[PDB]
mmCIF file of N, CA and C in Angstrom:
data_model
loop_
_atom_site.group_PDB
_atom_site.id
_atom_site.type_symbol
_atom_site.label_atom_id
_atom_site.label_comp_id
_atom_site.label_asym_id
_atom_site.label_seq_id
_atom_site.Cartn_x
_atom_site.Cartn_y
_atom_site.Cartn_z
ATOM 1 N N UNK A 1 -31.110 53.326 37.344
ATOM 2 C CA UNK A 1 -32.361 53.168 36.610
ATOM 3 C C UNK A 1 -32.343 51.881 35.793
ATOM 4 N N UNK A 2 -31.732 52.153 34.605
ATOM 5 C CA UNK A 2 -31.962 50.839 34.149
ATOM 6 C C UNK A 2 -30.813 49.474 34.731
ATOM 7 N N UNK A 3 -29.697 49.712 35.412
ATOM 8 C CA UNK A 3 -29.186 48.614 36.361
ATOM 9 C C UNK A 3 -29.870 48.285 36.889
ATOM 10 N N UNK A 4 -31.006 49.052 37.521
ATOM 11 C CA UNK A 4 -31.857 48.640 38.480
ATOM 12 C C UNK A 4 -33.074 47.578 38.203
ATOM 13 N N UNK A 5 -33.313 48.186 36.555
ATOM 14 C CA UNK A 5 -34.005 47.283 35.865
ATOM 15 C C UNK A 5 -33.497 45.897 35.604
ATOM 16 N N UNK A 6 -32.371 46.082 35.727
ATOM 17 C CA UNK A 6 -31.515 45.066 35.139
ATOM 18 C C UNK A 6 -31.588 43.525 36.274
ATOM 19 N N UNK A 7 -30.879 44.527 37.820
ATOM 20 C CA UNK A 7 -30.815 44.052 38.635
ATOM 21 C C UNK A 7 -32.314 42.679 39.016
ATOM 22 N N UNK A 8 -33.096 43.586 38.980
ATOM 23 C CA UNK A 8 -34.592 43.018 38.951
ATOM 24 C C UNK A 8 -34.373 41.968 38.127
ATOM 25 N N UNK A 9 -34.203 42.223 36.729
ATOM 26 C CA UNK A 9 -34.226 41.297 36.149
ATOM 27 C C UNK A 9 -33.634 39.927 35.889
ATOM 28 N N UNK A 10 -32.444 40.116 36.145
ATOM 29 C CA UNK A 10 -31.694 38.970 37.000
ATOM 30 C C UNK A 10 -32.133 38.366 37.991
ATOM 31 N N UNK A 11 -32.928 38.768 39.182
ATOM 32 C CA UNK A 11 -33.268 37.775 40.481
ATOM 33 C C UNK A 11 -34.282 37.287 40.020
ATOM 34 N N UNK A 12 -35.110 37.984 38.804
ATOM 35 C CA UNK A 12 -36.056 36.794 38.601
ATOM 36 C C UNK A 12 -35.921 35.537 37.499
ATOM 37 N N UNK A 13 -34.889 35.788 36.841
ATOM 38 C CA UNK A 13 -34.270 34.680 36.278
ATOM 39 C C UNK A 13 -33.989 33.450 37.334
ATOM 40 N N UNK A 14 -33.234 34.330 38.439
ATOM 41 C CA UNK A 14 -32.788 33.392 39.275
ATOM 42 C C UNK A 14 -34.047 32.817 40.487
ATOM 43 N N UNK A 15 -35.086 33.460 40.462
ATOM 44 C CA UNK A 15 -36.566 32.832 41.230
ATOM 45 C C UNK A 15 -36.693 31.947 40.435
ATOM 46 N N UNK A 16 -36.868 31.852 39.303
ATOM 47 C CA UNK A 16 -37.865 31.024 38.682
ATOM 48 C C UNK A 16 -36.965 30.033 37.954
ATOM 49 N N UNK B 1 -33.938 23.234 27.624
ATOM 50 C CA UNK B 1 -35.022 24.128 26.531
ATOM 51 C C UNK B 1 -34.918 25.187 26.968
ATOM 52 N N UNK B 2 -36.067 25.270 27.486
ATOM 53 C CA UNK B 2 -36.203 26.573 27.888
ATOM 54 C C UNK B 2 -35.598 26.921 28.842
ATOM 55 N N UNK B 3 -35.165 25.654 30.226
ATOM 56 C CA UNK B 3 -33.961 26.245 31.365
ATOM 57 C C UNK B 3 -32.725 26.604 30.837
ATOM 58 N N UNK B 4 -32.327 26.149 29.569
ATOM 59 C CA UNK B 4 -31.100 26.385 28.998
ATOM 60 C C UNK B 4 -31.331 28.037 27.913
ATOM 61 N N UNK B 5 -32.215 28.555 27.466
ATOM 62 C CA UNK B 5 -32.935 29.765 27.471
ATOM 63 C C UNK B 5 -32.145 30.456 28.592
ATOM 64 N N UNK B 6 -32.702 30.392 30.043
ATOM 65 C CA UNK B 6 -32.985 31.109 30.884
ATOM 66 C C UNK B 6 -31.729 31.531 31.506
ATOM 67 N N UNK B 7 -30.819 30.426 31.743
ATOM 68 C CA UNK B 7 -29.498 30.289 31.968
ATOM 69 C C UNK B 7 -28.779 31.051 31.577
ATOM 70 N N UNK B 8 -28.434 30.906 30.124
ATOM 71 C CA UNK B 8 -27.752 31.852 29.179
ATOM 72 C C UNK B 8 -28.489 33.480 29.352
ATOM 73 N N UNK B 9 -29.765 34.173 29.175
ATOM 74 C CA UNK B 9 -30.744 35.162 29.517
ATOM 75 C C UNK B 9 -30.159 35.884 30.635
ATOM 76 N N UNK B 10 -29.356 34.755 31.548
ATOM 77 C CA UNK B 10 -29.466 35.631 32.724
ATOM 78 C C UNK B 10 -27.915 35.744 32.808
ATOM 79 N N UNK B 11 -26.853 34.498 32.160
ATOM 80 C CA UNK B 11 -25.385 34.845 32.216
ATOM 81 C C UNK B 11 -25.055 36.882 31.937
ATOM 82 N N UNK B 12 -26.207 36.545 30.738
ATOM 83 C CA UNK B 12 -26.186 37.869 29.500
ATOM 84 C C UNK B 12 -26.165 39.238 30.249
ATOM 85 N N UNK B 13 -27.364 38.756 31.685
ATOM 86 C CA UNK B 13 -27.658 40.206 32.261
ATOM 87 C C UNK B 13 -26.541 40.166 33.328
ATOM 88 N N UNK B 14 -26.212 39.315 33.813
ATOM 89 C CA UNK B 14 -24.530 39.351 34.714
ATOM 90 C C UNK B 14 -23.968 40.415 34.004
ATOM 91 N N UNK B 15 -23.728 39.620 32.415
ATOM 92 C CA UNK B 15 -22.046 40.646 32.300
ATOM 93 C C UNK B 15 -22.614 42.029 32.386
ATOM 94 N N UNK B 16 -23.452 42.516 31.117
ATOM 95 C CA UNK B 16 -23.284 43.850 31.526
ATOM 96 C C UNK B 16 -23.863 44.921 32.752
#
């Protein structure tokens, strides 16, 4: 759940 | 600036 949030949140650090 | 923000933001979500 929230790793998952986490996860997410990391690749879009790394998109942008 | 702000890439140096983002950088660090996202080292942060690596570790834990």
């Amino acid at each position: 759940n929230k790793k998952l949030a986490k996860q997410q949140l990391e690749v879009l650090a790394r998109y942008l």
